[PDB]
Design a protein around this ligand. Structure first.
Ligand SMILES: CCCCCCCCCCCCCCCCCC(=O)OC[C@H](COP(=O)([O-])OCC[N+](C)(C)C)OC(=O)CCCCCCCCCCCCCCCCC
Ligand SMILES: CCCCCCCCCCCCCCCCCC(=O)OC[C@H](COP(=O)([O-])OCC[N+](C)(C)C)OC(=O)CCCCCCCCCCCCCCCCC
Ligand SMILES: CCCCCCCCCCCCCCCCCC(=O)OC[C@H](COP(=O)([O-])OCC[N+](C)(C)C)OC(=O)CCCCCCCCCCCCCCCCC
Ligand SMILES: CCCCCCCCCCCCCCCCCC(=O)OC[C@H](COP(=O)([O-])OCC[N+](C)(C)C)OC(=O)CCCCCCCCCCCCCCCCC
Ligand SMILES: CCCCCCCCCCCCCCCCCC(=O)OC[C@H](COP(=O)(O)OCCN)OC(=O)CCCCCCCCCCCCCCCCC
Ligand SMILES: NC(=O)C1=CN([C@@H]2O[C@H](COP(=O)(O)OP(=O)(O)OC[C@H]3O[C@@H](n4cnc5c(N)ncnc54)[C@H](OP(=O)(O)O)[C@@H]3O)[C@@H](O)[C@H]2O)C=CC1
Ligand code: SF4
Ligand code: SF4
Ligand code: SF4
Ligand SMILES: [Zn+2]
Lengths: 209, 146, 342, 155, 48, 115, 176, 96
């Protein structure tokens, strides 16, 4: 670790987190689909979306885990995948000073089970996912828009939603109220093509098709 | 390098002749009405059309249908092709059937009455490729060109 | 067409419509609606104003950046008019006072000034001139307001022959001084009417309909040189119309007849106001002047507009004249006024 | 001469209004902290007669200090309409002036001048407390040039 | 500046100007580029 | 492959029950909405608009999609009933300011290049 | 390591109990707070007499944008468009063409100051020190249009503020 | 230099001026069209050509790190003067 500019490696954590992944997969074969640990030492558990409550409850309550805090719950839109939405749970264990990421998937129409029974923090996070991505969480206390305007139609954070949207607001003196109209921009957003034609990272080269 | 001519000498507004006899700007409504009135009045061979070099197929068929509905078949181009025999009835009579890529597989090429360097710059470059890599033989029946 | 005035866009705020308009008298009831419709579709509007700039602030949000331009002008300076119309394709005259100030009379605001704008507009090569007169303008009318309107209507037509002249009826709207005039009569107890308002017939028209028709006249080649009459769908008796106003406002209606000579004297007593008079001898005569039926003149239906019934747009105007008890009463609680059939 | 009287009366009414500008306690985001700093000891907006009052009815100036979203926009027009006249609006920061760095967002009004009239635009992100103070004083000079009663006399 | 004076360039303003907003001297934005598409000018003679 | 987790309805018949129930709630609520928000429309106009929105989607035949549309509708009901919305939000269904847009070939042709 | 902020128990001797009672009845601690406000009353206020006194600034201050020149009077900008590309707000618009003398110069250089976040990335990216965020912060306007700056405006600002701009660069160019 | 059009409008260093029939010149009514009077094309031409005694010369624009990126200019053609692509300064090789 004497290279000034290169991030040091911590193999002790990599061995520790890798073993715990084997521990979870052995205990929860019914739902675990993949376990991976990264170069910068973070463990990811990838599960079938029907094991959200079983897996989260086990991690929260098992004595060799105790992930009592839900740091974040979010989603990622990957259109090419037939299940375009990736649901990510990031959990913190104060007892063992460790973090684990849990990943599952869903599509536009398939619901996910709400994690509120496991973590009461998930109430608002799940509302945000619905508002921004359109994913429905079943058996939620109150699922409704949280970040978008009242009556806003669409799910902005999907990759197919235009950045500037479809409608814009202004005040009209005739009707003496704020009205919504289709969006016209005096200056169109300028799309810059920045990707270089030359590969940068060989280690991630995808196998030829 | 010819894209810069698309920014000069452009037609931007409909134009019609005034009493003096000079073209003046007007609207689509007026101009289309003047044109349509004559189309209704005249019929048959009194209506004709000529298609230029940079015309799209969508417009060509559109114009054909409009003139057909006045029973006019005088749909013409500016580029002559013999109408004798099977004329345009058979595609093979007026196509480069060997394809551009076929020149690479050819053994002899006979050029008649054409400067492929200027009429089809990229087609001549294909000939020279075969001339270079496949030892093609080329003959010409025309003015000696480079 | 010059390349700058060629229309582009989908008719929104940031679009281009090819309309470069000078609107005189834009700081009033009619102008604020005209400028809004002009600025909706991306038109360049020159707003020549006499008033304090604070009183033009409500116009600034009506147009995208640079599409509303403000100039100072004086109806007695012919050069100030020229600077405002020289670059414009259509000029709209909405200038007028319902009273006579010490400096400006009815002749100044309905004859002298409109003729000056028309004379300068032609000298500067403006294609279109839209002039607003009054449906009941007549040389032999009692009201000086209306007689001066007739004089100006003739001067405009002689100075700018291709001018479109639009002759509205009484216009009702949030800022009208028509339905609000009647509703504010509650302050003085009952409603004084001449002959109890059984001899005056009114045909009021909605402001938006007028705004749409004016705009469509700008965009219609046929409208040039014509004289239009903007009237509402239905004709009402003044008594019935006033009664409907109070019913919507849910205020007690105590109509009492007042002879012609008396309700003239009350006007003269309200004309002494150095500010904006509450009523005047002229307004008296006009409210009680029966609206003409001019079938020889084209109407809104010729310009594409559909007349808006009073029964649908009265509540928006008259709900601010209600008490808290009756504020929430709906549009279906007041049975519509009686209409004179055609 | 009545042109002298209206001129001096006009000076008085302008002097009072520019010497007692009461802004509405209304902020939206990170231009509001710099507005607090204009209220803090170093700059002390109070010394100019500028006093923050919460109610729109007791306010003369709305300083739009932050990004105006579409959800918020109806509320801003409401409190503006509820301000008695005369009323003035100061636009503070790029977000309010023209949307700034969220200008291309589905959830952002591309300027507060679409919703309400604006008298002064203060550029920055954030504008410094001194720059907002320059804008306030610039609004004061704008009021000093008002000619409401001189126009009335000539009306 | 009375001690350490600024460097002198020809193009620097000799007379400073205070803020000119709200005055006849105010800045009005405009495009600094010339026209893109030229348009065909019809002949000035009457054909036929 | 076609076996998919449902949302609420297991068949279109069960879903169309929820659509009708939702129409009932909306139809009761327009009279209060006009009164509470102090709108200048009639109750018939509002009930017509509710019918129009329900008609727009009159082609769907997927139980899951109909469930989501019902879910989204019910959310809009909680907003309107509880006055979370405002007069500007309720009146956005009626598109009053948007001047009519041309819907014939010639009219589109005269104005612009759009289909 | 950690410390307890409020985990102390009181003393139950009579003197302590009596002292607390006095504090409760005679409001000693409240009177103590009144003293601090009294001390501040006799301190010098921190207020400055703006606009006759200005708040301190540094040479690195990011203010109103300006376009600079070489000592010859020639524009430093060469239309590389790096400022346009790095601008996080897409506030810069540039069009360029060959000048009559063959130089690579701009025909358009527009900054929308209501899109700018005054981040200074465009003066970092510039390879010729042409675009700078100057010292001025007192350029508030009465209209939005006055804040849409074009090339002529930005050049006049450079010629207006060059003396101050150059001196500040001289101070900070060694840190850059 | 600033030359005025037949209408009276000032022409810019980019050759921009509003033609007679353009409505957009109304924005300047009661206000001004801001034009910088120092035309960089005219000022660079005033700078004298530098006589140097080498086939190759370097230019940094002056000021070192306060100038432009350093470039080298060939002066082997005697039908022209080497010009800098950044600062516009001209150089010539002095006959040995
Ligand atoms: C109180 C009871 C109700 C009111 C009763 C009637 C009014 C009595 C009070 C009169 C107050 C006069 C205040 C004078 C204003 C002043 O101080 O000038 C400072 C101002 C100072 O200039 P300044 O406002 O630009 O200050 C800028 C800030 N500094 C200076 C720090 C940079 O002087 C002026 O500029 C002229 C302002 C107008 C002067 C007053 C005009 C009216 C006088 C006649 C009124 C009677 C007409 C009948
Ligand atoms: C306790 C302290 C008490 C202090 C009381 C204040 C004493 C000092 C008062 C000075 C005079 C104030 C006048 C305010 C009038 C409102 C105004 O600003 O003018 C706008 C208006 C402008 O009038 P306008 O007709 O030109 O335009 C207004 C109409 N719109 C909105 C459509 C444009 O002023 C007037 O209407 C008339 C003002 C006349 C002169 C002042 C009032 C004289 C009558 C005295 C009773
Ligand atoms: C000697 C012969 C026999 C005669 C004996 C006569 C009796 C003499 C002994 C009686 C002692 C009475 C002590 C004073 C009254 C006690 C008040 C009290 O109850 O306090 C408890 C209260 C309550 O304190 P607390 O915190 O304990 O409240 C909770 C109470 N327990 C726990 C019991 C439930 O204290 C206050 O009153 C706080 C008031 C807050 C507002 C203070 C504002 C600042 C004021 C500062 C200036 C004060 C000076 C003003 C001078 C005015 C000059 C004109
Ligand atoms: C311009 C004007 C300048 C002159 C102003 C005069 C002085 C004004 C008050 C100064 C405040 C000083 C604070 C202070 O010394 O208190 C410290 C101390 C701090 O006390 P403490 O709460 O921190 O604890 C110490 C007390 N024991 C030990 C019991 C816990 O407060 C006092 O002891 C003062 C007690 C005075 C009680 C006054 C209330 C009775 C009022 C009766 C009516 C009269
Ligand atoms: C004797 C019998 C006479 C009965 C007829 C009296 C004349 C009619 C009076 C009503 C005048 C209506 C009017 O426009 O001015 C009244 C004025 C309110 O005017 P306002 O509501 O501000 O109009 C603005 C429109 N944008 O003022 C008011 O707000 C109320 C009316 C004046 C107060 C009277 C005391
Ligand atoms: N029911 C109606 O309202 C009807 C109206 N009309 C006509 O429509 C036009 C406008 O109606 P409306 O808008 O209600 O009138 P308003 O009084 O509402 O506003 C009229 C405009 O005229 C301007 N104006 C009046 N006198 C002068 C003057 N001497 N010098 C300069 N500007 C002046 C005013 O500007 P400022 O306020 O700055 O003086 C005001 O903006 C008028 O000509 C009116 O006669 C016709 C038929 C019916
Ligand atoms: S303008 Fe600047 S300070 Fe104000 S909210 Fe936007 S980013 Fe924050
Ligand atoms: S300071 Fe930042 S936001 Fe402003 S123009 Fe420069 S790069 Fe763009
Ligand atoms: S980075 Fe500098 S030289 Fe390049 S275009 Fe921008 S201002 Fe001009
Ligand atoms: Zn150089």
């Amino acid at each position: 670790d004497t290279r000034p500019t290169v991030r040091p490696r911590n193999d002790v954590a990599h061995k520790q987190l890798s073993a715990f992944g084997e521990y979870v997969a052995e205990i929860l074969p019914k739902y675990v689909q993949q376990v991976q640990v990264s170069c910068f030492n973070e463990l990811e558990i990838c599960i079938h979306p029907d094991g959200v409550i079983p897996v989260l409850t086990f991690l929260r309550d098992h004595s060799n885990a105790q992930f009592k805090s839900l740091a974040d719950l979010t989603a990622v839109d990957i259109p090419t995948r037939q299940n375009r939405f990736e649901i990510v749970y990031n959990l913190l264990s104060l007892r063992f000073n460790s973090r684990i990421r849990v990943k599952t998937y869903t599509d536009e129409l398939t619901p996910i089970e709400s994690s509120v029974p496991v973590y009461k923090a998930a109430n608002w996070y799940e509302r945000e996912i619905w508002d921004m991505f359109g994913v429905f969480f079943a058996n939620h206390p109150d699922l409704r828009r949280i970040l978008t305007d009242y009556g806003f139609e669409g799910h902005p954070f999907r990759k197919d939603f235009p950045l500037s949207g479809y409608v814009e607001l202004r005040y009209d003196d005739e009707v003496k109220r704020v009205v919504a109209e289709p969006v016209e921009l005096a200056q169109e957003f300028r799309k810059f093509d920045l990707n270089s034609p030359w590969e940068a990272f060989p280690a991630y080269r995808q196998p030829p098709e | 390098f010819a894209y810069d001519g698309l920014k000069r000498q452009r037609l931007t507004e409909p134009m019609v002749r005034n009493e003096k006899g000079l073209l003046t700007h007007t609207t689509w409504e007026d101009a289309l009405s003047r044109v349509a009135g004559m189309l209704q009045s005249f019929q048959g061979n009194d209506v004709a059309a000529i298609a230029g070099g940079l015309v799209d197929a969508e417009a060509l068929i559109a114009l054909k249908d409009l003139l057909n509905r006045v029973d006019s078949d005088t749909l013409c181009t500016e580029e002559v092709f013999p109408t004798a025999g099977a004329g345009t009835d058979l595609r093979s009579n007026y196509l480069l059937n060997t394809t551009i890529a076929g020149v690479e597989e050819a053994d002899v090429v006979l050029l008649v009455g054409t400067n492929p360097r200027f009429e089809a710059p990229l087609f001549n470059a294909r000939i020279r490729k075969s001339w270079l890599h496949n030892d093609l033989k080329v003959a010409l029946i025309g003015s000696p060109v480079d | 067409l010059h390349h700058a005035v060629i229309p582009h866009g989908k008719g929104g705020r940031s679009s281009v419509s090819g309309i470069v308009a000078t609107v005189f008298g834009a700081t009033g009831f009619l102008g604020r609606y005209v400028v809004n419709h002009l600025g909706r579709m991306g038109s360049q509007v020159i707003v020549p104003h006499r008033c304090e700039p604070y009183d033009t602030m409500h116009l600034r949000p009506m147009g995208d950046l640079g599409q509303i331009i403000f100039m100072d002008w004086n109806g007695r300076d012919k050069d100030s008019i020229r600077r405002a119309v020289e670059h414009s394709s259509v000029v709209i005259n909405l200038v007028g006072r319902e009273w006579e100030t010490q400096n400006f009379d009815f002749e100044d605001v309905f004859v002298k000034i409109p003729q000056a704008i028309a004379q300068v507009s032609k000298e500067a090569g403006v294609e279109k001139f839209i002039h607003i007169s009054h449906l009941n303008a007549d040389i032999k009318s009692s009201s000086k307001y209306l007689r001066s309107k007739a004089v100006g209507e003739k001067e405009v037509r002689e100075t700018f022959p291709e001018a479109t002249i639009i002759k509205p009826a009484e216009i009702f709207g949030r800022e009208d001084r028509f339905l609000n005039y009647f509703a504010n009569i509650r302050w003085f107890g009952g409603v004084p009417l001449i002959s109890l308002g059984k001899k005056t017939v009114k045909q009021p028209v909605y402001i938006v309909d007028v705004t749409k028709g004016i705009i469509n006249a700008i965009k219609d080649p046929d409208a040039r040189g014509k004289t239009f009459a903007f009237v509402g769908p239905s004709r009402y008796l003044l008594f019935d119309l006033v009664q409907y106003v109070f019913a919507v406002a849910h205020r007690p209606f105590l109509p009492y007849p007042l002879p012609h000579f008396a309700y003239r004297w009350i006007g003269r007593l309200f004309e002494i106001s150095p500010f904006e008079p509450w009523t005047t001898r002229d307004k008296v005569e006009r409210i009680h002047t029966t609206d003409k039926i001019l079938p020889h003149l084209p109407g809104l239906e010729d310009l594409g507009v559909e007349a808006t019934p009073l029964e649908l747009k009265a509540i928006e105007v008259l709900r601010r004249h209600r008490t808290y008890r009756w504020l929430s009463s709906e549009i279906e609680d007041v049975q519509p006024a009686k209409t004179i059939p055609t | 001469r009545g042109e002298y009287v209206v001129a001096k009366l006009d000076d008085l009414i302008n002097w009072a209004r520019r010497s007692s500008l009461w802004p509405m306690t209304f902020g939206l985001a990170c231009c509001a902290v710099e507005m607090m700093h204009m209220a803090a000891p170093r700059y002390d907006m109070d010394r100019f007669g500028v006093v923050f009052r919460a109610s729109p009815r007791q306010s003369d100036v709305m300083i739009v200090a932050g990004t105006l979203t579409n959800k918020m926009a109806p509320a801003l027009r409401k409190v503006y309409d509820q301000m008695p006249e005369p009323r003035y609006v100061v636009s503070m920061g790029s977000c309010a002036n023209g949307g700034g760095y969220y200008h291309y967002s589905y959830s952002v009004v591309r300027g507060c001048d679409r919703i309400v009239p604006v008298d002064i635009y203060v550029p920055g992100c954030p504008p410094t407390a001194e720059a907002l103070l320059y804008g306030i004083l610039q609004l004061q000079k704008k009021i000093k040039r008002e000619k409401r009663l001189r126009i009335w006399y000539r009306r | 500046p009375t001690v350490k004076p600024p460097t002198a360039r020809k193009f620097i303003w000799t007379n400073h100007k205070f803020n000119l907003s709200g005055t006849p001297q105010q800045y009005v934005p405009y495009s600094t580029t010339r026209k893109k598409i030229q348009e065909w000018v019809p002949p000035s003679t009457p054909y036929k | 492959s076609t076996s998919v987790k449902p949302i609420f309805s297991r068949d279109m018949n069960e879903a169309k029950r929820r659509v009708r129930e939702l129409y009932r709630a909306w139809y009761r609520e327009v009279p209060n909405t006009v009164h509470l928000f102090q709108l200048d429309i009639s109750v018939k106009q509002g009930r017509d608009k509710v019918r129009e929105m329900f008609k727009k989607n009159a082609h769907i035949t997927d139980p899951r999609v109909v469930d989501l549309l019902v879910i989204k509708g019910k959310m809009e009901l909680e907003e309107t009933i509880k006055v979370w919305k405002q007069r500007t939000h309720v009146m956005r269904f009626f598109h009053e300011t948007e001047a009519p847009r041309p819907k014939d070939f010639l009219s589109k042709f005269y104005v612009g290049h759009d289909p | 390591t950690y410390k307890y902020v409020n985990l102390r128990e009181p003393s139950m001797d009579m003197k302590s109990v009596t002292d607390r009672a006095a504090q409760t009845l005679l409001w000693t601690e409240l009177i103590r707070g009144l003293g601090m406000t009294l001390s501040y009353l006799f301190r010098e206020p921190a207020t400055i007499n703006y606009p006759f006194e200005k708040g301190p600034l540094s040479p690195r201050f990011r203010g109103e944008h300006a376009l600079r020149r070489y000592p010859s009077g020639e524009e430093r900008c060469i239309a590389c468009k790096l400022c346009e590309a790095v601008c996080p707000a897409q506030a810069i618009t540039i069009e360029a063409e060959p000048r009559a003398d063959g130089s690579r110069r701009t025909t358009r250089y527009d900054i929308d100051m209501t899109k700018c976040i005054y981040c200074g990335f465009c003066q970092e990216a510039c390879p010729v020190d042409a675009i700078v965020e100057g010292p001025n912060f007192e350029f508030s306007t009465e209209t939005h249009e006055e804040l849409l700056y074009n090339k002529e405006k930005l050049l006049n600002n450079g010629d207006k503020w060059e003396a101050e701009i150059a001196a500040n660069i001289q101070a900070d160019y060694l840190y850059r | 230099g600033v030359r005025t059009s037949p209408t009276g409008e000032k022409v810019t260093h980019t050759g921009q001026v509003y033609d007679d029939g353009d409505y957009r010149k109304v924005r300047f009514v009661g206000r001004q069209k801001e034009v910088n009077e120092n035309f960089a094309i005219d000022l660079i031409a005033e700078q004298p050509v530098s006589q140097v005694g080498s086939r190759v010369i370097s230019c940094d624009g002056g000021g070192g790190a306060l100038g432009h990126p350093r470039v080298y200019i060939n002066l082997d053609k005697e039908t022209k003067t080497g010009t800098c692509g950044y600062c516009g300064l001209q150089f010539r090789q002095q006959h040995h």
